[PDB]
C-alpha cells in the first residue's frame, strides 16, 4: 500500500513509481493476451500483441528468474529499462518523457 512513500527523489531513482507502473501495466496486458491466445490460434491478432508476448517471456526469464544473485535497486531498474527497451515510445503511455529521454537504451 505504502510503496508510494518509499519511492521518490532522495529515496531512490526519480522514476521508480512510474517504472513499476509501466512494468505492471505491460506485463498485465501480456498475461492477458496469453490468456487470449489460450482460446483462438496464434495468427488472428496484431503486432504489438506479439511484442507484448516476447516482452512477457523476456520478463519471466530475466526480471524474475534471477537465480540467487544479489541484484541491487540500481541494476534492477537497469534490467527494467533493458526490458522496456523493446516497446515503442508511443506505447509507454504513462511515464514522463524526460525519463524516456535519459533512459530507454
Amino acid at each position: 500500500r505504502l510503496m508510494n512513500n518509499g519511492v521518490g527523489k532522495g529515496k531512490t531513482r526519480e522514476d521508480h513509481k512510474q517504472v513499476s507502473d509501466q512494468l505492471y501495466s505491460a506485463y498485465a496486458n501480456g498475461v492477458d493476451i496469453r490468456k487470449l491466445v489460450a482460446i483462438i490460434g496464434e495468427d488472428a491478432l496484431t503486432e504489438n500483441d506479439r511484442r507484448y508476448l516476447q516482452f512477457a517471456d523476456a520478463f519471466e526469464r530475466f526480471f524474475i528468474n534471477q537465480g540467487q544473485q544479489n541484484r541491487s535497486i540500481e541494476e534492477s531498474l537497469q534490467i527494467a529499462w533493458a526490458l522496456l527497451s523493446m516497446l515503442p515510445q508511443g506505447e509507454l503511455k504513462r511515464i514522463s518523457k524526460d525519463h524516456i529521454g535519459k533512459y530507454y537504451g
Partner: protein, 210 residues
C-alpha cells in the same frame, strides 16, 4: 452460488462426475476427427498432384495452340464459347454441418458449329475441361478438410476451456460446501457438550444442597 445442504453437495459431485466423463468423451471425439483428418490429407495432396499434372498438360497445349496459330483466332474463339453456367453447390450435411460440394452442368459436346477450322483449339478445350474436372475435385476435398480442421479446433478449445474452467469452479463450490457443513456440524456438537454439562450440573449441584 447455491445454499449449501447435504443435497447440493451430492448434486455438485454428480455435476463434477458428468463433466469429468465429458472431458474424456470429447477427447475420444477429437481422436476420431484426427483419424479422419489424416485420412483426408493424403487424398487432398494426391488430387492436388493430379491437378498439377493436368495443369502441365493444359498449359503446354494452350501455349502451343496460341503459338502455331495466331492469338486472335483463339481470342475470338474463347470469346465465342458459351459461359458454362449453372455450376452450383449441393449438400454434404455431416457433423450436422452442410458443406457445399460443387458440381457443374457442362455444355461440352455441343460444339460451336463443329465444322471447326482451327485444329488445336478443341484439343486444348478438352484439356481444360479435364483441368476443370481436377479443379473441382481439389475444391470439394479442400473445403471439407478445412471444415474438419476447424471442428478439431472447436473441440480442442472446448476441451481446454471446459476442463480448465468448470472443473476447478465445481471443485471450489464443493470445498466451500464441505467447509460450511462441517462448520454446522461443529456448532451442533458444541451444543451437545454444553447440554451434557447442563445435565451433569443438574445432577451434581443439587446433590449437596438438594
Amino acid at each position: 452460488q447455491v445454499s449449501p445442504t447435504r443435497m447440493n453437495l451430492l448434486q455438485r459431485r454428480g455435476q463434477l462426475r458428468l463433466a469429468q466423463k465429458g472431458v474424456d468423451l470429447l477427447k475420444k471425439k477429437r481422436d476420431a476427427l484426427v483419424a479422419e483428418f489424416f485420412g483426408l490429407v493424403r487424398e487432398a495432396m494426391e488430387a492436388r498432384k493430379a491437378l498439377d499434372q493436368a495443369a502441365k498438360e493444359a498449359y503446354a497445349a494452350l501455349l502451343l495452340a496460341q503459338a502455331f496459330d495466331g492469338p486472335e483466332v483463339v481470342a475470338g474463339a474463347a470469346l465465342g464459347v458459351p459461359p458454362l453456367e449453372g455450376v452450383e453447390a449441393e449438400v454434404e450435411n455431416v457433423w450436422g454441418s452442410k458443406v457445399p460440394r460443387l458440381k457443374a452442368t457442362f455444355p461440352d459436346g455441343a460444339l460451336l458449329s463443329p465444322v471447326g477450322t482451327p485444329a488445336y483449339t478443341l484439343e486444348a478445350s478438352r484439356a481444360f475441361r479435364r483441368y476443370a474436372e481436377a479443379l473441382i475435385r481439389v475444391a470439394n476435398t479442400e473445403t471439407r478438410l478445412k471444415k474438419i480442421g476447424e471442428e478439431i479446433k472447436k473441440t480442442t478449445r472446448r476441451v481446454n476451456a471446459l476442463e480448465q474452467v468448470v472443473i476447478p469452479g465445481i471443485r471450489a463450490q464443493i470445498r466451500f460446501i464441505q467447509q460450511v457443513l462441517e462448520q454446522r456440524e461443529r456448532e451442533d456438537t458444541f451444543r451437545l457438550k454444553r447440554i451434557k454439562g447442563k445435565i451433569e450440573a443438574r445432577e451434581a449441584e443439587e446433590e449437596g444442597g438438594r
